[PDB]
Design a protein around this ligand. Structure first.
Ligand code: GNP
Ligand code: PHE
Ligand code: MG
Ligand code: MG
Ligand code: MG
Ligand code: MG
Ligand code: MG
Ligand code: MG
Ligand code: MG
Ligand code: MG
Ligand code: MG
Ligand code: MG
Ligand code: MG
Ligand code: MG
Ligand code: MG
Ligand code: MG
Ligand code: MG
Ligand code: MG
Ligand code: MG
Ligand code: MG
Ligand code: MG
Ligand code: MG
Ligand code: MG
Ligand code: MG
Ligand code: MG
Ligand code: MG
Ligand code: MG
Ligand code: MG
Ligand code: MG
Ligand code: MG
Ligand code: MG
Ligand code: MG
Ligand code: MG
Ligand code: MG
Ligand code: MG
Ligand code: MG
Ligand code: MG
Ligand code: MG
Ligand code: MG
Ligand code: MG
Ligand code: MG
Ligand code: MG
Ligand code: MG
Ligand code: MG
Ligand code: MG
Ligand code: MG
Ligand code: MG
Ligand code: MG
Ligand code: MG
Ligand code: MG
Ligand code: MG
Ligand code: MG
Ligand code: MG
Ligand code: MG
Ligand code: MG
Ligand code: MG
Ligand code: MG
Ligand code: MG
Ligand code: MG
Ligand code: MG
Ligand code: MG
Ligand code: MG
Ligand code: MG
Ligand code: MG
Ligand code: MG
Ligand code: MG
Ligand code: MG
Ligand code: MG
Ligand code: MG
Ligand code: MG
Ligand code: MG
Ligand code: MG
Ligand code: MG
Ligand code: MG
Ligand code: MG
Ligand code: MG
Ligand code: MG
Ligand code: MG
Ligand code: MG
Ligand code: MG
Ligand code: MG
Ligand code: MG
Ligand code: MG
Ligand code: MG
Ligand code: MG
Ligand code: MG
Ligand code: MG
Ligand code: MG
Ligand code: MG
Ligand code: MG
Ligand code: MG
Ligand code: MG
Ligand code: MG
Ligand code: MG
Ligand code: MG
Ligand code: MG
Ligand code: MG
Ligand code: MG
Ligand code: MG
Ligand code: MG
Ligand code: MG
Ligand code: MG
Ligand code: MG
Ligand code: MG
Ligand code: MG
Ligand code: MG
Ligand code: MG
Ligand code: MG
Ligand code: MG
Ligand code: MG
Ligand code: MG
Ligand code: MG
Ligand code: MG
Ligand code: MG
Ligand code: MG
Ligand code: MG
Ligand code: MG
Ligand code: MG
Ligand code: MG
Ligand code: MG
Ligand code: MG
Ligand code: MG
Ligand code: MG
Ligand code: MG
Ligand code: MG
Ligand code: MG
Ligand code: MG
Ligand code: MG
Ligand code: MG
Ligand code: MG
Ligand code: MG
Ligand code: MG
Ligand code: MG
Ligand code: MG
Ligand code: MG
Ligand code: MG
Ligand code: MG
Ligand code: MG
Ligand code: MG
Ligand code: MG
Ligand code: MG
Ligand code: MG
Ligand code: MG
Ligand code: MG
Ligand code: MG
Ligand code: MG
Ligand code: MG
Lengths: 393, 60, 205, 82, 85
RNA sequence: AAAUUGAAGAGUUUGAUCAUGGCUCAGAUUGAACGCUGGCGGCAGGCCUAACACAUGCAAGUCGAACGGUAACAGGAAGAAGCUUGCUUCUUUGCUGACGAGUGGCGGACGGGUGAGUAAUGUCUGGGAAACUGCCUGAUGGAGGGGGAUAACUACUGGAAACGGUAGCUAAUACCGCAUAACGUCGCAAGACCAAAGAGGGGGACCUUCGGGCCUCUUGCCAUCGGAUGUGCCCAGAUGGGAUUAGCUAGUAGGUGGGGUAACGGCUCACCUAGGCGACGAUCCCUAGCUGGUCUGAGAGGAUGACCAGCCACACUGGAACUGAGACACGGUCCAGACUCCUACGGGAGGCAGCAGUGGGGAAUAUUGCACAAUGGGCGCAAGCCUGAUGCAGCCAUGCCGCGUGUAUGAAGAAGGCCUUCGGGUUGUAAAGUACUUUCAGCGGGGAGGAAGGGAGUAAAGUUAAUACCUUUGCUCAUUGACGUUACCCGCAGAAGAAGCACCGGCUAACUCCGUGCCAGCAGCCGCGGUAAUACGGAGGGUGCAAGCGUUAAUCGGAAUUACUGGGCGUAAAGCGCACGCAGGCGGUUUGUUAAGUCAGAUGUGAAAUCCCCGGGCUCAACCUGGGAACUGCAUCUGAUACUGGCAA
RNA sequence: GCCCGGAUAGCUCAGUCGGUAGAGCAGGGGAUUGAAAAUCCCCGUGUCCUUGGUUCGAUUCCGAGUCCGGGCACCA
């Protein structure tokens, strides 16, 4: 909080995806040290990508850590997702804001059960583009074995509905590029080139009014309570009226400073992760899931009609019917929420792999409008995608 | 202290943080306070129209 | 700030004619006056000692269009002023601009006079005044501004003032909409029906 | 050092200055020996505008008291023969 | 500290180096008189009194000592010389 | 001419009564909070609890007219070198203006903040001598002639930093002698002794050794005696609660002598005496800043001491002194401590009870805004720079006060609701409908008043050898607003954008119908509900307030329920079981005689604000404001002698 | 942000390792009374915290949640 962030180069939200203990967080650390050395950005280290007691005694990552590496063309903003099956909830918030992912499959183990689950969540939420990275390579010195894994990833993406063969696969060790090997340093400089070439300039919405889903809340010692997240649409000027909408009720507020990776800003534009400082609000009363909207634009609702597309055994979801009373998790912009289902008159049961509409009464009210996309989940797996039809409350 | 819970029906149980104002009940000997309906975890009375500042209920 | 409800309802509860909806026509005969305050209008009231005081206060309030906070402040001024506390209460009420504008005959009703004062029409001693509560001092000259002079509402309302008693304490030109407030109003000049003594009783306790 | 200076009373945007004989170390509005007239800049042409008791000024300025920049101007405003 | 007028710290420390020495000098010349007093006639004591008289008066004029301090160190000290001897 | 015009009761013990006596209510009021509902403006206010711990920026600097600096920086002048000979390179010049870093001056001790401590060291009222007092200001009269240092700057090192050391060197209003000194300082006096600093703006004449000297004039220094303003100290009375705290006390209480204090003093010592305080409450304990005031009251009183003003106290906790005119020093210093801190592990920091802001505590209380434009404050000849003092702005119905939320006509007495003896009533001129406004918001143009000054010039005065320079000035110039898309004025537009929430059994203004059946619930007091509830829940209808309304808490009132004004004690609560009796309270009657009480007068004071009355100024009000009265007092001074006291018969 | 416990008819508790849950204390219906209480004669009055899954069948076995309990961290 001192240096002013100069608005140059387009902003892009990137993040690593993949199996547990597969080189996902280590890739993030490899991208910093490579890009910082040659081009001349800020250095950083593997340290702080994940500190705490939880991510040291174990070694695993829980929190979605962020990184800011810069290149001549564009200014990237990383989102290193956790990895585990148990940490899928806080991952989806990191994955929703992420524009273009970096998948991490390993040459030794290959595509594992979570790799299938992570890419499954990427499609239904909103991950337009994806890039593969083989994160072991050196451990198995062979030409035939390493190339057989590349075939299975191309099959995985094409089976689950992506381009597959068009996606640029890259090979390279993360640990070898951490130190200073000339052949392996240049091979991850190549990944930065694939990030620029494949993923296009993202289409923002700098016209329709201000909205910002809160991914994680903070309490800065001195300044006040702060909320982070990607600005979904519109802009934010300093000293402007902002209404916080979502869970509990609704509160008036005013912005008193927006920032971008510990650097000041005047205008917080759309499609970029920013930390908004709020005036006269406590850490407890504001929570994760709520949205920073401009007053009057959006209203919180606890009941709505919605066209739900349930999945089958083949697509990956439920395989049995269910009657009114069923309570799955509904993942809107960031947070999840439970709700009872009231089916329409003339529909006795809901079979798997079927398009229908239904009334859903949620326990917590969330801010929503007509034409909002969500992904239903229940029992550590997906259920179905859909869209909102009508407001009731 | 003991505190009386006014209105018909309540959400109070086991714990739940509530607000207390003064006022005896004059019936339960020992009870000498009233819970404020509306404030904190104590919600408003369900389906009330007349006298709703007392009992913490919003407009219809 | 104002009543803005059923105005002729107030007259039936009080019983007597309050001049709220006096207007163009002289006598109403269109409400069942006296014997229908509300649903239970046929109910003959017992009417206690506090009742008759409250009914008398509420009558004088509703005639002059004043609320309890502002009305109780007139009593506090009336007590500190010299002479009789009762005579001062009503003398200060009659000194209001919205009341003087009604008594001059630039308004069929007192609410119409209040709106006329409030909407930049009324002017006194070469100065525009918006406040209905404006205490009109002795020896003044209230009048209408030339932009809003001889508009449709004032000319018809001035013809009504010929049927009225017309006060002695003030004088009106009638040609060029120009008034002249001269002296302070006496007790015996006006009303001779609304009791002051009972209103002094209500506030003293 | 005793000094003759303005006190600044009155409402917001509606100043009224009590010219007053006070010690330099004491605050503007605070302690004084004795007040010696007043000044009103938002008075305009009417009955009253500025008053300044010149008899008490001889007791202080004659002995040893400075006159502030604004109060020195009001002694010129009231005049000796104008 | 958070000010540029900490010159006063180094100035007041520089003052008392000087200020203590001249004070120390004075109170030794006064001790010189009390040393002479006790076992001595009016001769050795009054010689020491004539030596300190200019020193105490001078330091009184410079603001180290106050003029009444100086006044007493003549007044009470002459009363020792006059009464005893 | 005006300064108080002021004193209300009701419900509730009983089958009923009168009394006693509690309980509760009607009114004012607030730093408020909460619930529901929320349009504007104006003026006020807005961490009472954790004196909790707090990142970040900022709250005190200033002068070149003190001084070295021929300057860290940016720029003119004598001269230089390149070459597009005025375009460029560039050494000298206090020399262009100034000023980073110093050295000295004055400031930092004021201005802000907070009530932790403090029951008397404090505060209040009235007195009183033993005092000091920078800046300001009266008077007198000096200010003469010398020295040795010393930073900065180098030079050379140490250190991670903070911050040093060693070798030079140099300036002064820094520093110290010396002469020089009195109505000054000690003394019986004779005597002795004690100081100073120089600057800046101009010059004819003549010395030029050019650094000019000498006239010049503002300025500054220094000694005394003074005023002014502060401040230190002393006394008297007053200033909370507890006796289920009755004895405390050894520098304790006084003396003589010495030291010390700006000043007197057990302030502090040495010895001497054996006190001193105490029932008119010492000591100990708990609580507490104090006052002007505030709220309340018919007044006496009771409660309270947020905001404005005076005094005190305190500054991370516990100490000490240094500097100074002033501090035992909020943003100095030094230790010690607890807690945060950074490091190269040697050592360093740090102090929001300045302004914003954070966490935490809490029922609860705000912007890391703009500005020195004004008003004071700081230095300075000034210009100016500095200023979270102040002035604005934000926020919050937290209050007090203003205007809103339309205004006439309108019978088919419509619909719909609600009630009914189904005839009709009522909601209700309510609505719709037609006639009109256009305040306030919403827009577009106009646009004050807060601004006095400071300059650039001038004109005569001042001042002098001078038609100079400063002191005073009157005339001509161009300017100075954070507020600010200002106050206020017009210009459209269309009723358009603008109403709730208590209550409705008695006290207490206002009633029916359904639902429920001592259940669910209400309740300020009495009390409502057991299948026909006016008290519960809803509905309609009413009543009372209205951008507020209620609930909660808090103080006084009513409470003559701590009674001094103004109560009681046979039986309601209440005469010790009965005596004696010291201290204490009270005391027959006549003369004196003082004057303590008492009374009368007079003078000083009782800060300003506040209150009160007559005015005045904001469109009105709240708000601001002139004068008056008042400040019920306390002191002294002069009388009066009836009464009370003292004192003699 | 993530670990862990807690919930069984109106209240206080038993019961389970898939075999379909009970006890007291309440409550209700009739008799009686103005209504009760006792007296007399009859009744569990249940979303096993919610929801899905493994199965013929889940309180019971395995996920996902609810609100609440206590625990460890992150400083745009
Ligand atoms: N030899 C080698 N080892 C690697 C390479 N990349 C990753 N690893 C190893 O893989 C392990 C996983 O590290 P990390 O990336 O933090 O795990 P993750 O992929 O983020 N998943 P999660 O954080 O949920 O546990 C580490 O022990 C690391 O040494 C590589 O290129 N070469
Ligand atoms: N926009 C943020 C992203 C972030 C969120 C939370 C933790 C760290 C980073 C930056 O900083
Ligand atoms: Mg493995
Ligand atoms: Mg990881
Ligand atoms: Mg492991
Ligand atoms: Mg493996
Ligand atoms: Mg109002
Ligand atoms: Mg109407
Ligand atoms: Mg009264
Ligand atoms: Mg003071
Ligand atoms: Mg003026
Ligand atoms: Mg230091
Ligand atoms: Mg010595
Ligand atoms: Mg000195
Ligand atoms: Mg009574
Ligand atoms: Mg009574
Ligand atoms: Mg009875
Ligand atoms: Mg009786
Ligand atoms: Mg509030
Ligand atoms: Mg509230
Ligand atoms: Mg204001
Ligand atoms: Mg406090
Ligand atoms: Mg403390
Ligand atoms: Mg503290
Ligand atoms: Mg820091
Ligand atoms: Mg700090
Ligand atoms: Mg500053
Ligand atoms: Mg100079
Ligand atoms: Mg010079
Ligand atoms: Mg101070
Ligand atoms: Mg102070
Ligand atoms: Mg203050
Ligand atoms: Mg105080
Ligand atoms: Mg005194
Ligand atoms: Mg000084
Ligand atoms: Mg002086
Ligand atoms: Mg002189
Ligand atoms: Mg010399
Ligand atoms: Mg020498
Ligand atoms: Mg030397
Ligand atoms: Mg030397
Ligand atoms: Mg020298
Ligand atoms: Mg000196
Ligand atoms: Mg000296
Ligand atoms: Mg000599
Ligand atoms: Mg000499
Ligand atoms: Mg003498
Ligand atoms: Mg002599
Ligand atoms: Mg002599
Ligand atoms: Mg000298
Ligand atoms: Mg010179
Ligand atoms: Mg010359
Ligand atoms: Mg002179
Ligand atoms: Mg001088
Ligand atoms: Mg001077
Ligand atoms: Mg001087
Ligand atoms: Mg002197
Ligand atoms: Mg003097
Ligand atoms: Mg002194
Ligand atoms: Mg003493
Ligand atoms: Mg009063
Ligand atoms: Mg009163
Ligand atoms: Mg009374
Ligand atoms: Mg008190
Ligand atoms: Mg305070
Ligand atoms: Mg304030
Ligand atoms: Mg203040
Ligand atoms: Mg004092
Ligand atoms: Mg004192
Ligand atoms: Mg102290
Ligand atoms: Mg102090
Ligand atoms: Mg402090
Ligand atoms: Mg300190
Ligand atoms: Mg200290
Ligand atoms: Mg201390
Ligand atoms: Mg000293
Ligand atoms: Mg000095
Ligand atoms: Mg001192
Ligand atoms: Mg200080
Ligand atoms: Mg501080
Ligand atoms: Mg330290
Ligand atoms: Mg603060
Ligand atoms: Mg806070
Ligand atoms: Mg400026
Ligand atoms: Mg100033
Ligand atoms: Mg000065
Ligand atoms: Mg001068
Ligand atoms: Mg000038
Ligand atoms: Mg100035
Ligand atoms: Mg400033
Ligand atoms: Mg301030
Ligand atoms: Mg308001
Ligand atoms: Mg408001
Ligand atoms: Mg509120
Ligand atoms: Mg209509
Ligand atoms: Mg019109
Ligand atoms: Mg307007
Ligand atoms: Mg406009
Ligand atoms: Mg001017
Ligand atoms: Mg102006
Ligand atoms: Mg001028
Ligand atoms: Mg100025
Ligand atoms: Mg000039
Ligand atoms: Mg000039
Ligand atoms: Mg001139
Ligand atoms: Mg303008
Ligand atoms: Mg207008
Ligand atoms: Mg119009
Ligand atoms: Mg119209
Ligand atoms: Mg029109
Ligand atoms: Mg309306
Ligand atoms: Mg029952
Ligand atoms: Mg009945
Ligand atoms: Mg009924
Ligand atoms: Mg009711
Ligand atoms: Mg109603
Ligand atoms: Mg209220
Ligand atoms: Mg009371
Ligand atoms: Mg009383
Ligand atoms: Mg009595
Ligand atoms: Mg009695
Ligand atoms: Mg008895
Ligand atoms: Mg008895
Ligand atoms: Mg007895
Ligand atoms: Mg007896
Ligand atoms: Mg007794
Ligand atoms: Mg006796
Ligand atoms: Mg006697
Ligand atoms: Mg007698
Ligand atoms: Mg007698
Ligand atoms: Mg006599
Ligand atoms: Mg006497
Ligand atoms: Mg007396
Ligand atoms: Mg007297
Ligand atoms: Mg006064
Ligand atoms: Mg007045
Ligand atoms: Mg006026
Ligand atoms: Mg007026
Ligand atoms: Mg006032
Ligand atoms: Mg006044
Ligand atoms: Mg006055
Ligand atoms: Mg007087
Ligand atoms: Mg006689
Ligand atoms: Mg006699
Ligand atoms: Mg006698
Ligand atoms: Mg039964
Ligand atoms: Mg039973």
């Amino acid at each position: 909080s001192k240096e002013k962030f100069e608005r140059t180069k387009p902003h892009v939200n990137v993040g690593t995806i993949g199996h547990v203990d597969h080189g996902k967080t280590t890739l993030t650390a490899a991208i910093t040290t490579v890009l910082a050395k040659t081009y001349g950005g800020a250095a950083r280290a593997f340290n702080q990508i994940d500190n705490a007691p939880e991510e040291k005694a174990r070694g695993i990552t829980i929190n979605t850590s962020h990184v800011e590496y810069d290149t001549p063309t564009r200014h990237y903003a990383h989102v290193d997702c956790p990895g585990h099956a148990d940490y899928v909830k806080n991952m989806i918030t990191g994955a929703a804001q992420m524009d273009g992912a970096i998948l991490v499959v390993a040459a030794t183990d290959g595509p594992m059960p979570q790799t299938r689950e992570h890419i499954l969540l990427g499609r239904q939420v909103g991950v337009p583009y994806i890039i593969v990275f083989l994160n072991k390579c050196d451990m198995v010195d062979d030409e035939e074995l390493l190339e057989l894994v590349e075939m299975e990833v191309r099959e995985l993406l094409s089976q689950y509905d992506f381009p597959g063969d068009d996606t640029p696969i890259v090979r390279g060790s993360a640990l070898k590029a951490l130190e200073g090997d000339a052949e392996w340093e240049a091979k991850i400089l190549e990944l930065a080139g694939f990030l620029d070439s494949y993923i296009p300039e993202p289409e923002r919405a700098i016209d329709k009014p201000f909205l910002l889903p809160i991914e994680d809340v903070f309490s800065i010692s001195g300044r006040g309570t702060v909320v982070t997240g990607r600005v979904e649409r519109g802009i934010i000027k300093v000293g402007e009226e902002v209404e916080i909408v979502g869970i509990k009720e609704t509160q008036k507020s005013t912005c008193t400073g927006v920032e971008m990776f510990r650097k000041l800003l005047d205008e917080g534009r759309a499609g970029e992760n920013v930390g908004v400082l709020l005036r006269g609000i406590k850490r407890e009363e504001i929570e994760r899931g709520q949205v920073l909207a401009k007053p009057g634009t959006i209203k919180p609702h606890t009941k709505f009609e919605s066209e739900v597309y349930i999945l089958s055994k083949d697509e990956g979801g439920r395989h049995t019917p269910f009657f009114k009373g069923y309570r799955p998790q509904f993942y809107f912009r960031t947070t999840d929420v439970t709700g009872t289902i009231e089916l329409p008159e003339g529909v006795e049961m809901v079979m798997p792999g079927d398009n229908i509409k239904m009334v859903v009464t949620l326990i917590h009210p969330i801010a929503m409008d007509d034409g909002l996309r969500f992904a239903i989940r229940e029992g550590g797996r997906t259920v179905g995608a859909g869209v909102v039809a009508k407001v009731l409350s | 202290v003991t505190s009386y819970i006014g209105g018909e029906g309540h959400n109070l149980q086991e714990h739940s943080v509530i607000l207390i104002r003064g006022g005896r009940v004059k019936d339960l000997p020992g009870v000498r306070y009233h819970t404020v309906r509306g404030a904190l975890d104590c919600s408003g009375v369900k389906d009330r129209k007349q006298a709703r500042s007392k009992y913490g209920v919003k407009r219809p | 700030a104002r009543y803005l409800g059923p105005k002729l309802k107030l007259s039936r509860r009080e019983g007597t004619d309050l001049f709220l909806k006096s207007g163009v026509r002289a006598i109403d005969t269109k409400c069942k006056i006296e014997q229908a305050p509300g649903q239970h209008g046929a109910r003959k009231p017992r009417l206690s000692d506090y009742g008759v005081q409250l009914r008398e206060k509420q009558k004088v309030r509703r005639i002059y269009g004043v609320l309890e906070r502002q009305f109780r402040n007139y009593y506090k001024e009336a007590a500190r002023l010299k002479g009789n506390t009762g005579e001062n209460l009503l003398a200060l009420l009659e000194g209001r601009l919205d009341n003087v504008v009604y008594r001059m005959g630039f308004g069929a009703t007192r609410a119409e006079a209040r709106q006329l004062v409030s909407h930049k029409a009324i002017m006194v001693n070469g100065r525009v005044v918006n406040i209905a509560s404006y205490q009109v001092s002795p020896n003044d000259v209230v009048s209408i501004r030339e932009k809003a002079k001889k508009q449709s509402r004032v000319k018809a309302a001035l013809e009504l003032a010929e049927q009225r008693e017309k006060p002695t304490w003030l004088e009106v030109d009638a040609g060029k909409m120009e008034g002249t407030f001269k002296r302070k109003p006496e007790r015996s000049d006006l009303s001779a029906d609304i009791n002051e003594h009972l209103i002094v009783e209500l506030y003293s306790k | 050092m005793v000094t003759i200076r303005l006190a600044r009373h009155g409402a917001k945007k509606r100043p009224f200055y009590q010219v007053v004989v006070a010690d330099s170390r004491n605050a503007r509005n605070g302690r004084f020996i004795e007040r010696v007239g007043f000044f009103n800049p938002i008075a305009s042409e009417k009955e009253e505008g500025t008053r300044l008791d010149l008899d008490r000024i001889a007791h202080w300025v004659g002995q040893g008291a400075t006159i502030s920049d604004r109060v020195a101007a009001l002694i010129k405003e009231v005049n000796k023969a104008a | 500290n958070i000010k540029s007028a900490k010159k006063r710290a180094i100035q007041s420390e520089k003052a008392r180096k000087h200020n203590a020495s001249r004070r120390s000098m004075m109170r030794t010349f006064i001790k010189k008189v009390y040393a002479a007093i006790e076992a001595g006639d009016k001769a050795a004591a009054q010689k020491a009194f004539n030596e300190m008289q200019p020193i105490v008066d001078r330091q009184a004029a410079k603001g180290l000592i106050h003029k009444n301090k100086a006044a007493r160190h003549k007044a009470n000290l002459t009363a020792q010389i006059n009464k005893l001897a």
